[PDB]
Amino acid sequence: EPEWTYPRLSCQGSTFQKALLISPHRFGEARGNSAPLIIREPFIACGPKECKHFALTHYAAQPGGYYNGTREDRNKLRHLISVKLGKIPTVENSIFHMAAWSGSACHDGREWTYIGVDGPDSNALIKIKYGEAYTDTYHSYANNILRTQESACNCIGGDCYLMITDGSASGISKCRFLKIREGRIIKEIFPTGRVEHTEECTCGFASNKTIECACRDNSYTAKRPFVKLNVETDTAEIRLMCTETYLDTPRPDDGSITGPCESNGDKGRGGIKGGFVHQRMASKIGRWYSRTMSKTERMGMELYVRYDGDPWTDSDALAHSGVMVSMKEPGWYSFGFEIKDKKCDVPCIGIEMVHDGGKKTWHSAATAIYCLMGSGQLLWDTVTGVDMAL
Amino acid sequence: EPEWTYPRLSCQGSTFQKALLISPHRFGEARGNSAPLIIREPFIACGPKECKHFALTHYAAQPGGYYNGTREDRNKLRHLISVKLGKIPTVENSIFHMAAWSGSACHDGREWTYIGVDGPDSNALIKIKYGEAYTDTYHSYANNILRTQESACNCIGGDCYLMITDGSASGISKCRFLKIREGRIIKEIFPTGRVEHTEECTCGFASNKTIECACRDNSYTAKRPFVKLNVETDTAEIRLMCTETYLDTPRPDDGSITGPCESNGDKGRGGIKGGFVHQRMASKIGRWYSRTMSKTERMGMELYVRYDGDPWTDSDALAHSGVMVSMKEPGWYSFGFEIKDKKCDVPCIGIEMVHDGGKKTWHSAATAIYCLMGSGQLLWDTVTGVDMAL
């Protein structure tokens, strides 16, 4: 058959550069003739030959008559959709995979696994699809909005790993990982460590032995929960990132959180999903991260890197590597993903750039992509170009 | 060349869950830019890799100018169309297969067979297409709206099997089954038993030896005619389902038809096509059924199951298995179908949810899908989200 995917060494390069903007609402004017779907939580996942751009639609287009409710996060209508990356996600270009108000997907080398959560808040349900077939489900364990990554899951040798979580958005949400093979859950992994609130993990392969994830703590801290999952033993441990460059939003000033690495610090309530991707070299690992320019608002997006070290213990500041989105522009969720070149993997970060005009109008998003590309420094930023009044 | 398809054991699971909603008129607003087709009698059929979503269109779109007459069932413009399941059935996404006002389709492992009926009411005509080619026809034998299933036909080792019927919607309509191989009728099967009125059969494989169908009696009863068709001898027998949980609409109260399993009972006149799909386990057979929540109107849809036994002799109540559509939402035709996973088949029930505003406006339908996945209880219902005034 095709063989299973494994993480490979990253393609050569040392800086990210602006790759691609998908801005569907550049075609959504009342006087235009297009039907871009109203979405949020976009992410990209790639198989050997193509990438798919996923998002959770509100099952409504612009221009249209169903803008009310598109700023809510969960309802009976939201669906996980995709287009081939490079296509504009319209009503006719998109594929509707399953009813879901939280999602993930990934390719294992042979087929696409799609993951969607729906159901009532107190009793939601993870549903897994392998290709066309619905293959398995997993139930709410803490009865308070069972939910998942909003970014790609990760497969090695046919085994795919997925973060799920359940619990209060302003209290305890202890995550678990599911190990999924051909669409069926073959193991539950219960993490150890600093486990009181971990959600929306952005995960990737640090090597063939370790998946690492930079997650969101929506309750207690502006430091990101950082997971290290050993794939050989199927065990996970979580501790907060110690870097003084706090990656959440909102957050206090860099380096202002006093005390040991594990200290929670101030301005911990609230959060945002954060970009994280690995650059695997023969003797060095680069960890690339994105955070908003604003410490309190979803505005702007800049890139940081650090090579080697241990995220759990290094207090050192990360190295600023370029402004991807200016302060002037929306910088909402961000995520990592890798494109498969012929012999090596290309690390990328994608940025959700939400068009927010409040509850009174439509609420949707463009997706900007920056990838590791050549050398030098990052040269240009992204704007959506959308005027929400048209 | 490809192997012929056979029924396989069903994938593991014990409950159905909400899978997917195709709601094309969420995009039909007069201020939007899309062209969802106006349709009724949707159904889905799957081949080894892909499923198609079929329906009978009135050859008109919303927004548009041809709404008048879209609440009629037969005319010279209706056509059988399909799209790949998960796509939206618009003017450009759809393929028009043949002129037809009653239809069916199925894949035999190698090619699609498409069936459509058209012609004048008193002398209509079954037409069969195998791939791109028109291959055969079957004539009216009762000269009173020759018609067929409005759901998937069923193929085993290249032989595909199809219910047709002809006769008065208010009296006698004896059905027949056609055995079709590579688009040509190779055998006609004349059933035995209770044959006074059988139409709109929803059929599936109980095993490699038997096809069973839950059908509609539009004239005499609210119990469903239940066909057992022996594929090895090509013989069929029909008797009424004996369960007190009457599956037709309209219907009397459950358990109220006194007398032997064959008693017709009250409120027999009228009917609806009903969902039915098999869960074939190694030692046992689950028969899954759907019926409207209202006893008299096409509103709501509930799921029921019974393991093993004989539908013709068992008076036992079917086990209520969850609300798919609440009573506030339309619940019109339902149908069963199976998705082919790698090693096993996934049973699903699809629900036609008609937007009915009467004859003064457009008349069309959303399709909701529920499939067997995981364990537990069915968790969430389906709404169309459509406002017919927009």
Add this chain to the structure above:
Amino acid sequence: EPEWTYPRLSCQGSTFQKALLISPHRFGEARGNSAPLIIREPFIACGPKECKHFALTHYAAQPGGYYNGTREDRNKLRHLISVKLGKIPTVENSIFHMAAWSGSACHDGREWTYIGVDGPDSNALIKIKYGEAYTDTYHSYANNILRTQESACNCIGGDCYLMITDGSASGISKCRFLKIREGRIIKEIFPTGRVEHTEECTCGFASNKTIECACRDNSYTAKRPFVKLNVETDTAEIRLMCTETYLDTPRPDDGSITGPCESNGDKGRGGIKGGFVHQRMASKIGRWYSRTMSKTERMGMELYVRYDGDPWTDSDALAHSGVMVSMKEPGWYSFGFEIKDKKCDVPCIGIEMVHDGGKKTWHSAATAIYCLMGSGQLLWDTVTGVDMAL
């Protein structure tokens, strides 16, 4: 490689039946959201696995602002376009093959040959394309609107044959045939016989040795020029059809043309392209033909057949085989084509049903298809369902 196509015996059957209507302008209302292309001269040609529906577009859609000039036949904008048969020919569904105001195309088993004529009236040019590549041209020989079939060319063992003509529409237009192999003209065939005016031939295979064509005489007669082209010797002879059932429009009353078979008769000025297709049986050949219901106007369409005999000498009336389009509806150009089933060929006739509101509004066409299908008699007619005011 794939092997070359040859005509095979026709699939079993004895009557035609309504197969499919493509009516693009059912979606062209000013308040709808679609873009059907404005076309005329549709025809269908099929390869082993699929059929393409071709037409000459005016490079304009409905609704739109370029309706002026769409009732003219030749200009700098007209293009040969196609869609897969079954798709609606819109701006986004269509492929634009080449600039052309007269066309033909056919598949040889390995690739599509597309043929288009354009250039000034006094000096037009046949251009041939094989797949994507432009491969050859042929020049005007009588300098007065060099033109071709408006229907499929015909390939046997890799050699494709095409009628072209040039000359006065109301005088002499002596046709020639080109023999084309992999897109290049390898022979010119100059017909013998009754050669003064032959245009718009509808041609098909009577056997592996003979192509026959029923053509239009726009100047001298209402009898159709009937070509017999011997494929083994590459010679052609033309004589008028002798049947008293005159197939052109306009025409006198059947059987009113006195004198020998070759007599021209009255009402010969004007003409229409006519449907003709072969049903090849082991010991018998059926010639199926279509003509308008009206003797003088492009209204209605009925089917006729005759088995065996010699068209050049049989004065006998053809047998009426059904009304495909009532007198009430447009019946403009018609054409034959064959769909390839697995082991046999299916003969079909397609009918151009032009929406004519005069020079003041848009002018375009729907395409109706009738194919040999089963037995009995033809049961239903086709309407476009279009209101030209919307």
Add this chain to the structure above:
Amino acid sequence: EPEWTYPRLSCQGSTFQKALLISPHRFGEARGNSAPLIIREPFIACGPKECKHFALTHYAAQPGGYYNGTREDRNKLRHLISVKLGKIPTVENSIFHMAAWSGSACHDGREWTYIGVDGPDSNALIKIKYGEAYTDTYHSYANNILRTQESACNCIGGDCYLMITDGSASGISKCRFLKIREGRIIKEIFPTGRVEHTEECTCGFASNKTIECACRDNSYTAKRPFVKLNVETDTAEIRLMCTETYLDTPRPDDGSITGPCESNGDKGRGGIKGGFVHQRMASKIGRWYSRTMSKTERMGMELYVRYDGDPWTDSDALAHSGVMVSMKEPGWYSFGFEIKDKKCDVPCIGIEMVHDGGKKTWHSAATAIYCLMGSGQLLWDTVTGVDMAL
């Protein structure tokens, strides 16, 4: 896996003829229902089976609300897009490859290489994509709008070759050539000779040993810089074309620049990218060129040819070969490209026909194609048919 592509001898033919018009704004009327993209710098490149039609979009459609700024050349929204040749480039038909305000692409027999330039004017960046993956970048070396061909790059045995340039549009812009293999730059080529200003080179293979390019000098002359690049030694030399038929716009009268082939002459300032394609015969080489009909404005387009000789030393007038676009119609950039027939290559010239209404309205372009086919003289010209007021 597939063989690498090499140039082959051209298909037989001695004249170019009108092939195809892609005029997307024939569908852009405010009362229509389509979304043609706003674009400039179209070009076409072909692989063994298919050609793509590329362009640089302003990420806006007609009808729409983002016309302001579509007459500017560089900004943060322009993207390189393509569709399959023959399709219309709308929002939904197109694929967005990468953010870019200057581009090129070519197929090497195995995969597509896509090149785009973006970044700030003083520090822009070549980015290269091979298939789906971003693989390499090249930095600005003169810090003054690094930019590239706006037409196909050229590959031979896996090595693809690309002109880039950087420097003042009013002064010195020394070009360089990049040798790219599987998306990565493996050699930089620094030309010799007359190097003061070369940009927008249109390049093709004169043979397996030499790539030649006719380029634009925006500063000093109306004669075109002509590159001869030796693929075996990877060296290049540039000298001005000596023909009296000056191919740039603006230009003085033909033959008016007195002095040796290197004299710059008058009206050197300004320029236009010009069409150029090779016809490689067994014993001889045809060089086909296009230039505007007006000497000063981008109006009309005429075809010229010269067989053999040396472009650097030959003062001879080129042979006028027909009017492709009359003086009444726009004639802006032109480019050469080759279509792969089964055994030989078909040379073609494409013409950008811009709809220019000034900065107060939309600014976009039709693409007209002429290719070598048959013998005789070029017969018909191309009009866009677009009314910019609709």
